[PDB]
Copies of this chain bind each other. A is one copy, B any other.
Amino acid sequence: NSTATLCLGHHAVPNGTLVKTITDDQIEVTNATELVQSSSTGKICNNPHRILDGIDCTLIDALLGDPHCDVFQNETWDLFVERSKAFSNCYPYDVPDYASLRSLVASSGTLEFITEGFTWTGVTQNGGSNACKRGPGSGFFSRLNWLTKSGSTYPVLNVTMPNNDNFDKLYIWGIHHPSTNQEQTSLYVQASGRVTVSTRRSQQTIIPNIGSRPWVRGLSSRISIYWTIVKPGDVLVINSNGNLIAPRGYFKMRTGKSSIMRSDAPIDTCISECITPNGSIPNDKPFQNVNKITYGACPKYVKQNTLKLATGMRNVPEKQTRGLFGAIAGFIENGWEGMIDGWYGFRHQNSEGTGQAADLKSTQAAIDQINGKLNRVIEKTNEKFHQIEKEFSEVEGRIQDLEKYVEDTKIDLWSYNAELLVALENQHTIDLTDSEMNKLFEKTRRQLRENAEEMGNGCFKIYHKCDNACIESIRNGTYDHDVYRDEALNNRFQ
């Protein structure tokens, strides 16, 4: 024989995954990764963020100093975890703007308490109740001072405390709401109380409300909790004529990365940066689908459960529809399921035999750009610490509707971003792999000047006698057309 066949092609596999592109909803690739984390271990990892498990304590009971919460004094945290089995076992109380105080104390990240010398004059301190039993005796919140009439008098109280330090000081105080007109007089000589608490720049005044409420732990009376922040250089004044739950000291305040989360997952020993209420998740993927609530370095929440990024080429599973020869057939036809060493490669039919090989230059380069794509996409800063509430237990009206509207707007815009990026990138991936294929072909055609012709099967009918060494030279990039030119021209045109 006086002629040779040389064909080009790309690897195929037996089993493929389907991806979403621009034009079409399904297409079959050789390999594809997942970009959405769907699963959790179900436990909270204790490194590298410092976790503080509240057990039967809320953060507002720990601060006030409820008796079953005395483990928590001078504690610090990055994340505080509240449990759904938590309860209260002291005087019954309410906090106007509860939500604001809870958010302020959680971002501070400490319960550091400094006792101060306050001089209450002409009154009896350390009032108590059997709604709050610390041991067999009656008790009260550890950080507040119930004041009551001494003898037959409650004098107008007037005290001042100045900030001369270089940090901010948070004072918690309150007021008692008695259930009758006969209890008010019994505790405080007057008939109507008043509590005024002021700085140089602000003031608040509260009056007490009298009347009957549902029984909780044997009482139809309640306490109302308030707060004031005093800056460096400013003064505090307190001026009450009755019903004052006085402060005992101040709390230090920091700006940092601390927050709070309501969860029911157990705590465990392991290392994880992202925490959700369903336990810790890994942060290798760019998106997540576990929970919209998060803490620390985390993937973005989206609505989808699956987004597949193509890491391979298109998969034309082979025509075992073949000839007697299974005449070597190239890329224009189908893929090659018998190639393992590399993606792009050459099959040669010669007098010597049939053969096969792979190509490093091309296979390397494709792999390079696809790996690039992967790196821009998979990994980046989304490191976030304190945020709005995204779950509610009551109906409130206006503010809560705006908080729900803000969160849904964010989710639909990030979900649209995630859908388009995958479709764009998947199209570009198919295109770059197919151009790479056609680049090897033109390189081959350019080397075989007039000593070869194209058939249109993906194949080059060479009109001279090519041996294994000659095929190897073409494959190599050293084929010297001049040597066989005269023979090939006389063979092809005559």
Contacts and interface: CB of A to CB of B under 8 A. Distances in A.
A373 B22 contact: yes
Given A398-B399, A402-B388, A406-B402, A194 B214 contact: no
Interface in A340-392: 369, 372-373, 375-376, 386-388
Interface string A453-464: 110100000000
A216 interface: yes
Interface string A206-221: 0001111110100000
A77 to B, nearest CB: 19
A165 interface: no
A417 B406 CA distance: 18
A100 B388 contact: no
Contact of A203 (B160, B201, B222, B403): B222
Per assembly, the copies of the chain total 3
B401 A386 contact: yes
Contact of A237 (B214, B425, B454): B214
Given A22-B428, A446-B454, A394 B229 contact: yes
B239 A97 contact: no
A85 interface: no
Contact of A449 (B196, B432, B453): B453
Interface in A390-440: 394-399, 401-403, 405-406, 409-410, 413-414, 416-417, 420-421, 425, 428, 432
Contacts of A416: 417
Contacts of A222: 203
Q: Which of A398, A416, A428, A493 has the most CB of B within 10 A?
A: A398
B372 A24 contact: yes
Given A23-B369, A104-B395, A205 B198 contact: no
A25 interface: yes
A283 to B, nearest CB: 17
A123 interface: no
Interface in A192-251: 194, 196, 198-203, 205, 209-214, 216, 222, 229, 235, 237, 239
B398 A103 contact: yes
Contacts of A209: 194, 196, 203, 205
A302 to B, nearest CB: 13
A213 B229 contact: no
Contacts of A239: 211-213
A121 interface: no
Contacts of A23: 369, 372-373, 376, 428, 432
Given A23-B369, A103-B397, A395-B229, A212 B158 contact: yes
A263 interface: no
Contacts of A201: 94
A101 interface: yes
Contacts of A453: 449-450
A405 B402 CA distance: 12
A219 to B, nearest CB: 12
A24 B446 CA distance: 29
Interface of A: 22-25, 94, 97, 99-101, 103-104, 158, 160, 177, 194, 196, 198-203, 205, 209-214, 216, 222, 229, 235, 237, 239, 369, 372-373, 375-376, 386-388, 394-399, 401-403, 405-406, 409-410, 413-414, 416-417, 420-421, 425, 428, 432, 446-447, 449-450, 453-454, 456, 489, 493
Given A25-B376, A416-B417, 17 more contacts: A22-B373, A23-B373, A25-B375, A94-B201, A97-B397, A158-B212, A198-B213, A200-B214, A200-B216, A229-B394, A388-B402, A399-B399, A402-B403, A405-B406, A446-B456, A447-B456, A450-B453
